[PDB]
Design a protein around this ligand. Structure first.
Ligand code: GEK
Length: 333
C-alpha cells in the first residue's frame, strides 16, 4: 500500500472478509487496521483502557469490544462472544505490553490462545528484559507455544522494511496450529517463510511525510510551548536543524528526527523533536509516521493521542504480515 490512505480504504479491505481475526490488547487499533487492510473481519477486540476503547470505537463502530482485564477472560469466553467453535478462528492477534511477582500478560495471552486454538497466532513481545533473561525468556515463550500444539517462529522485524517511515524494531512470534502446518506443509525449515518479504530498504520520514494536513496555528503553539521550556534551553536549542542522522540529546531520551532517515521509534512517552522546527512532532505527523490513515480519529488530550499512536503496531507492517499469512497458510485451506 501507498501513503496516504483513508479509513474508507480500511473499510473496503475489511469488506472482503477473507479470514477472521481477534485482536487482544487491541489499543487504538494499529494492528486491527492492518488486518482489515489485508481483508480481515475483526470478530472482536479486547482492550481494558477506556480511552483506547473510545478511539477504537470511533474508527470501527461495528467491532464488538470486550473491556475486561484479560486476566479475567478465557479463550472460551472469546469463543462464546464471537460464536466460534475451537480451531475455527483464523488469526488470534496480541501485543501484550511491558524478588516480587510481576504479571506477564504475554503468558495470559498464550493461556487464552490455548482455549481458542486459532489456526495462526501473531504476537509481538515487548517485555523489558534484564541481561541474562532475554534469550531464556524467548525460549520459554517458544516452548510455551509448542506446548499448546503450535509450530512457532520468531523474528525482530523493522517496520521501515515494509513501507513505514520508522525504525521500529520489535520481536514478533508467528505460530501455526500443528494440524494446519501439516496440511500446508510448513516445517521447522520453512517456518520462517511466514514472515513477509521486505518491500523497502529503510523508508525515511521524507519518503512518507509529504502533504500532511496541519493547521499552522496548532503547529505554532507547539513551537511556542517548546521555546519557552527547559529541554529547549538545555538541549534542543543546541541540536542542529535538518540533521542527516538521528540526534541524541545526550550528545549535547530526547532525540531529533531526521528527514533523511526512518523516524525514531514512536513510544508511549512521545518526546521526538521535529527535524526542522523547534517543537515535538505533531499528532498528524505521528499518525503518518505510524502509517495510519490520514483521517484516523484519535480521542482525548494531545498527550493521550500521542500515547495511543506510540503504542501501535504500524498498520502497513501488520498488513504485510497478514497478507503473507493469508497467501502462505489461509488461502490453502
Ligand atoms: N490486562 C489487560 N487486559 C486487557 N487489555 C490490556 C491489559 N493490559 C494492557 N492492556 C492494553 O493492551 C494495549 C497494549 S498496546 C496495543 C497496541 C495495538 N497493538 C495497536 O496496534 O494499537 C502495546 C503496548 O503498550 O506495549 C494497551 O492499549 C493496553 O491498554
Amino acid at each position: 500500500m501507498k501513503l496516504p490512505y483513508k479509513l474508507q480504504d480500511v473499510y473496503d479491505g475489511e469488506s472482503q472478509a477473507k479470514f477472521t481475526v481477534i485482536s487482544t490488547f487491541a489499543g487504538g487499533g494499529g494492528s486491527s487496521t492492518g488486518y482489515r487492510l489485508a481483508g480481515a473481519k475483526i470478530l472482536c477486540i479486547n482492550e481494558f483502557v477506556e480511552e483506547a476503547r473510545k478511539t477504537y470505537a470511533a474508527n470501527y463502530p461495528s467491532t464488538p469490544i470486550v473491556p475486561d482485564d484479560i486476566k479475567q477472560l478465557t479463550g472460551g469466553d472469546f469463543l462464546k462472544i464471537t460464536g466460534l467453535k475451537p480451531r475455527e478462528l483464523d488469526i488470534l492477534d496480541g501485543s501484550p505490553p511491558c524478588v516480587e511477582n510481576i504479571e506477564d500478560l504475554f503468558f495470559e495471552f498464550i493461556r487464552v490462545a490455548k482455549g481458542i486454538q486459532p489456526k495462526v497466532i501473531v504476537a509481538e513481545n515487548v517485555k523489558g528484559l534484564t541481561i541474562g533473561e532475554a534469550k531464556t525468556y524467548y525460549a520459554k515463550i517458544t516452548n510455551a507455544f509448542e506446548d499448546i500444539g503450535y509450530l512457532v517462529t520468531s523474528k525482530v522485524m523493522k517496520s521501515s522494511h515494509y513501507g513505514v517511515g520508522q525504525a521500529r524494531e520489535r520481536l514478533i512470534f508467528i505460530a501455526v496450529r500443528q494440524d494446519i502446518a501439516d496440511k500446508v506443509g510448513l516445517n521447522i525449515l520453512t517456518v520462517s517463510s511466514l514472515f513477509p518479504p521486505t518491500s523497502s530498504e529503510d523508508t525515511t520520514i521524507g519518503d512518507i511525510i509529504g502533504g500532511v494536513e496541519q493547521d499552522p496555528e496548532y503547529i505554532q503553539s507547539l513551537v511556542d510551548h517548546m521555546t519557552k521550556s527547559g529541554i529547549y534551553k538545555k538541549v534542543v536549542s543546541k541540536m542542529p536543524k535538518n540533521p542527516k542522522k538521528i540526534l541524541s540529546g545526550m550528545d549535547y531520551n530526547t532525540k531529533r528526527a531526521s528527514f533523511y532517515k526512518p523516524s525514531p521509534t514512536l513510544t508511549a512517552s512521545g518526546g521526538l523533536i521535529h527535524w526542522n522546527e523547534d517543537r515535538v512532532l505533531s499528532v498528524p505527523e505521528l499518525k503518518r509516521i505510524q502509517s495510519l490513515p490520514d483521517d484516523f480519529i484519535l480521542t482525548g488530550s494531545h498527550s493521550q493521542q500521542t500515547e495511543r499512536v506510540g503504542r501501535m503496531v504500524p498498520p502497513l507492517m501488520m498488513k504485510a504480515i497478514a497478507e503473507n499469512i493469508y497467501k502462505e497458510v489461509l488461502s490453502k485451506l
